[PDB]
Design a protein around this ligand. Sequence first.
Ligand SMILES: Nc1ncnc2c1ncn2[C@@H]1O[C@H](COP(=O)(O)OP(=O)(O)OP(=O)(O)O)[C@@H](O)[C@H]1O
Ligand SMILES: [Mg+2]
Length: 1350
Amino acid sequence: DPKLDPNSENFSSAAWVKNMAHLSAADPDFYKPYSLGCAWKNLSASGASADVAYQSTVVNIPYKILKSGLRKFNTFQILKPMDGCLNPGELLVVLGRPGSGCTTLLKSISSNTHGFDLGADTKISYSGYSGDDIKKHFRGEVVYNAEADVHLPHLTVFETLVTVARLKTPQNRIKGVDRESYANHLAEVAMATYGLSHTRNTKVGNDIVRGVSGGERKRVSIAEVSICGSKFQCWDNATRGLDSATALEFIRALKTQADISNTSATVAIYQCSQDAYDLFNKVCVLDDGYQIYYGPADKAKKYFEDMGYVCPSRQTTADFLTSVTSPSERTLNKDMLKKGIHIPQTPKEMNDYWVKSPNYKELMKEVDQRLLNDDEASREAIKEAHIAKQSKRARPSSPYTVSYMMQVKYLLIRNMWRLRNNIGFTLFMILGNCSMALILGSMFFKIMKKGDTSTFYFRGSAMFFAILFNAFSSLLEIFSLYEARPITEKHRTYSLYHPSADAFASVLSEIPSKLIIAVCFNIIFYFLVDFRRNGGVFFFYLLINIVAVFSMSHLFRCVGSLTKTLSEAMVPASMLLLALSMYTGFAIPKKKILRWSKWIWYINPLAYLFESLLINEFHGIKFPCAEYVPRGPAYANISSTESVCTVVGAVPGQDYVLGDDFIRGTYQYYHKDKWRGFGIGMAYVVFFFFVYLFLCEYNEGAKQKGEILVFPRSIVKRMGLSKSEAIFHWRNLCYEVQIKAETRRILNNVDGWVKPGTLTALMGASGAGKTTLLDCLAERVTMGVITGDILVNGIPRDKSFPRSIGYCQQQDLHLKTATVRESLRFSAYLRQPAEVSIEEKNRYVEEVIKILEMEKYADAVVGVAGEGLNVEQRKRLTIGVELTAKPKLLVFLDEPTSGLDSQTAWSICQLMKKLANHGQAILCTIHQPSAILMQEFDRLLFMQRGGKTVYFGDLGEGCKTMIDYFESHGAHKCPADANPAEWMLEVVGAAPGSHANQDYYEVWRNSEEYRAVQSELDWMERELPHEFSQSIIYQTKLVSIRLFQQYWRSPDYLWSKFILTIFNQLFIGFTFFKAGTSLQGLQNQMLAVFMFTVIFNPILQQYLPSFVQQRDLYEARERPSRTFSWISFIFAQIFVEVPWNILAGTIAYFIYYYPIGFYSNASAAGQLHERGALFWLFSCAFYVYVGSMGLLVISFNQVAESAANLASLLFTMSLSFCGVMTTPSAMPRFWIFMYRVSPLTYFIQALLAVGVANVDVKCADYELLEFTPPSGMTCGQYMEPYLQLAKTGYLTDENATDTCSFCQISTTNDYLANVNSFYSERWRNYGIFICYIAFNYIAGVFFYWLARVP
Ligand SMILES: Nc1ncnc2c1ncn2[C@@H]1O[C@H](COP(=O)(O)OP(=O)(O)OP(=O)(O)O)[C@@H](O)[C@H]1O
Ligand SMILES: [Mg+2]
């Protein structure tokens, strides 16, 4: 009964673990009990130095790389020599100020040391194993839980836990159960023993996606680590966000499992009750890298008090130890100074005192024997116990409990759950691909039916374009590879599974979509374009199409797994797409690919597959010639030696134009075998699948290096408020949200007020509606429906309210790059009243910097959590960013003091009390406040599970009023030495495994205190005494400057965009270097312009994820706070992205226009200086337009994948109805509508016109067709009748009679007009194109308001 984990009425973790120990001790031969500790000598770590740390940026990256090479061909020492031994079954607790080396120590002992590197002197021993042998075989018996709560935002809690449970279900589990049931039950127990059972089906969420609360997210990570069952745990920062009851229960769970299962655990906790601290066996203290004390937990005070300090009567032991490391709170023994004995004050001298202290001697006496202890039996049990723990067929020398294919199965189920969550994008993929099949099939339907020479070109074009559209679609899979990277790194550290298992699982998860897409697209396309013979001919094409799809998908995944970000991937991706575009053998045939760059043909899968497809679609099938050179009624009695078939490879004077001869000529595919393409294609598919798996596992990573300070080069190289009268009050506030089709009410009749000249706490268990209440009050709720009335002075809050409060998120939402002082300055400029000059605002910002003690890092770079700024620094920045705003009605504080050292907690509480004394009304939420913090609070609002008020009234001088209230209505007396803040939560039963004697919500509702507060509120309802601060243009200026500094100082995006343009356009231009002006040369000069636009997809998609990131950050904190309106945000995006695109187009001009030879045509025609300028303008316009389209598509999409797909689909529609794809003369139906409206039409017509217009052609011998004219007549007289209707010329020999060679076209204007391209049209095209850009930005600005703005 007490161990059925879904039975919340009775479940008791201790019972479950004791029972499982009784079961696992029953047959030690089968369960193989074992033990694991450690012991370390002279542990020292060192890392980078300020001489090399800088804020990388576009200008400095080249020099930075050069100096990095020099560095490879004064390192900051972080952990100065340490020691200690940790016997199995004994907890260890690490204490120190934030920045003192705690997490680095934990990472060091658990052989998880990415980033820094240990000293050569260090010596670690996991009871016989060296550090490396843990990585090589047993990584999994030593688990480090980083402070960062990293999860997939959308995967619910139960799925998150059950996946790892599955992955860790041992063999030799209870010898009566199957794998699935055991995994499910293990997940249920793990999530019931940590109070997570009511979040069974809620999104784990993240700092942006609203899901489980921060404390619940931390507990999800704790439970995930717990399910593992490792015998050595290191908890980086366990109690960040946990209340003072759940934290105690977590520590008790560790103690229980340690004393029952010989587990060891080293937990670095920053605030811990006196009773919680009593549970630990060994204590470690750190100060700026030095080890001050290591030994029994209970002797800590008895040892430090011997040094010369003294404990205040109401300071807990852990707070005392942390205090000794702070020069302010520390207190010296006045008597001992009188005696003349010195007392170490600086960390170095405390280390000197300790190393000389006897305690260090008895520490060494035991460390040495554990490090020198080798029995060849202790490590035998671990080996025997481990291999027995694995699946039947797993490799014994592997650190993963379950073999490969099982890992793939479970990760595949997880990825299928991800697909379920994102079903919208995949459904869009399928629908859009089908619709593009039906659209392209429509652009040819009525043409192919002719069966004459018309098929020899159009069917090939349609085939090539279907393949290239498949290529475009495959490029969208790069987006998937990046979401799960941090999570797979996390799981790698636990040795759950091979990363290649996750890669394989992603591939499999995507296969079904690709088969459905391929079969539908191919059946439709074939049914209305190609040969239409439903014999095996069709099925062969189906096979080759699917093989091409798979080959492209694997190639793109393999290249996209070479980088750290999507933007960096797009450089390989664009190069590869472009190569797979031109070099397939239809764009530019084999005989034509220049000798300079030939090798790309052979390495091209699509080239071989297209060769096979053409063999299929032309071998042994004949069509009749059309389009003879001399035609019309002017000729009769023609002769075989007197007419010519314009189709290349045609037999002379005969209609038997066999397809074999065709392909032999045009594409040189003269070989017989069609199966060649299939084999080499499948070889590519398999080989690159294996390369992708190797790349994602053996040489891939996304791990953070550490909280280093960046300090941009420009800096390092040179190195309250007045009164407000309005009260704030609310009543009956009730809030309900929808989960799994079953709504849950998370606030219930919460009523209370906060009025000026007061400082009102807000405590309650994690999972109570603290943050939910605050959001409901600050107008930040996004889902559900609130009821009841909030007010200000008895009037509903006006539109000016959201800016008049100051609300500090419990999550830290700031730019990666904007420095601290810069962030404060930005906020002060935009939010503080406009009547004060910038000088005053800047002075006040510096005053805040002084007040909050940030000066020694005011210029650092915010960076990412876990990567660029400590937790204490990040929280101080988060509250300063709002102090500087000068709020005028309230100041909320969601978590001003949670998860950071007790001394800094007290400092922030002193700041809060000062502000409240000055006049501000504060309402802060508090977790684990020591008794010395509770004495600063004036009122208290107390919440039960489910967001039910359980107290609201004064705390009193010594917390007397709340104590009296709770004891007055029935509750066990609070001990004199007990902390009131913790006794109160013990009574309410906030602990996951504990329940109260009665439901105190009813108690409160029935109390005279509740009637008192209700009467207060009713009276105060009888009370009686712009949206943004700055002008819209001003805030637009500021946000645009910030975003310019954001693209600057963010090299991965701009520098990648350049590299992409540079190399891509270089590749295009040189593929078509100086194409000439012949028929085949002119064809290349048309293709190059036509191929200039294929880059639309990758260059557009580089931008989308960056914009998604800025949009998430903006709408997370700065939209509800009304720092600057949405229109300002969009205008900043536009004004910042434009000029960079202009520069990109400028460079593309110079690296593209000249090599192809356009300048030669412009100069020969005598119009150089105009055509150069016009071509430059069109390049700039194209790049601006690509940016604009990227902005338009993303405006109304939550996900970049769907937006990118929409952009690619629109691009393909605009492109298929363009160029020579289908001659506009051949499409007189209504489908011309998209032709006239598409922008690629105007761009390409204008660009061909400028590039190749008004110059003469020079046919080469291989292109000159020839015929023998009628006897006696001369060629000129014989062709003049044709010429009057032909409006062409270039007859080779006018007066010859035996034979004359001819060219279909004489003036290039003829060829351009053939595609409806005109030189006189150039300017109107530019006007239309810029108008399209303008409309596109108008629609992009509109759709944001339509969709994202509430
Ligand atoms: N990889 C690194 N290279 C150089 N210095 C580092 C590195 N990581 C951290 N530091 C520096 O070492 C000091 C201590 O960092 P530490 O790893 O102890 O963070 P912490 O105190 O554990 O904070 P948290 O508990 O939030 O991780 C910091 O001042 C930081 O600048
Ligand atoms: Mg919260």
